[PDB]
Amino acid sequence: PTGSLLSTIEVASHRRLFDFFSRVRSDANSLY
């Protein structure tokens, strides 16, 4: 169809790269 309307499927994620390099003590509600 030429009158259609696409959209980008979005992937939102909380990656945590630095838990694997060292210890973390974060809060319960840290959207870091």
> Considering beta carbons, is residue 2 or 7 the nearer one to another protein?
7
Distance from C-alpha of 16 to C-alpha of 2, rounded to nearest angstrom = 42
> Considering beta carbons, is residue 3 or 17 the nearer one to another protein?
17
Residue 4 interacting with another protein (CB under 8 A): no
C-beta of 21: minimal distance to another protein in Å? 11
Exposure string over 4-29, b if 16+ CB within 10 A, otherwise e: eeeeeeeeeeeeeeeeeeeeeeeeee
> Considering beta carbons, is residue 2 or 22 the nearer one to another protein?
22
